[PDB]
Amino acid sequence: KLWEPGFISFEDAIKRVSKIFINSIINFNDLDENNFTTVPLVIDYVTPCALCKKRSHKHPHQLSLENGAIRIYKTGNPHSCKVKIVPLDGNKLFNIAQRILDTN
């Protein structure tokens, strides 16, 4: 089990990460709780990449789990793409409210 289902249903997290990727995901079906940190995410770059804004990517992206979040990073040349983060805990409005109180 590479996924800890203590944050969000794995299907919902995959739905979020797919929504981030405007381009169609090729192997969306095989992402499960025991492979999502291993298999590269091959993407059909019909549209420009949603992260690097280029025409396409030479190498597929990859997912990592860290600090209760998903880190999306490109293989091969790291600086050629932007690192992306998907959170899993907290209503975003609650984070905003915490920041606003935080200012005093």
Is 25 an interacting residue with respect to Zn ion (CB under 5 A)? no
Is 84 an interacting residue with respect to Zn ion (CB under 5 A)? no
Encoding tokens for residue 11? 């299907």
Which residues, listed in sequence order, are joined to residue 74 by a DSSP beta bridge? 61
# of chain residues touching Zn ion (CB under 5 A): 5
> Which one among 14, 31, 43, 49 touches Zn ion, defined by CB under 5 A?
49
> Which one among 52, 65, 86, 88 touches Zn ion, defined by CB under 5 A?
52
Which residues, listed in sequence order, are joined to residue 61 by a DSSP beta bridge? 41, 74
The shares of helix, strand and coil residues in the chain, as percent rounded to the nearest 5, are 25, 20, 55
The residues that touch Zn ion, with contacts defined as CB under 5 A, are 49, 51-52, 57, 81
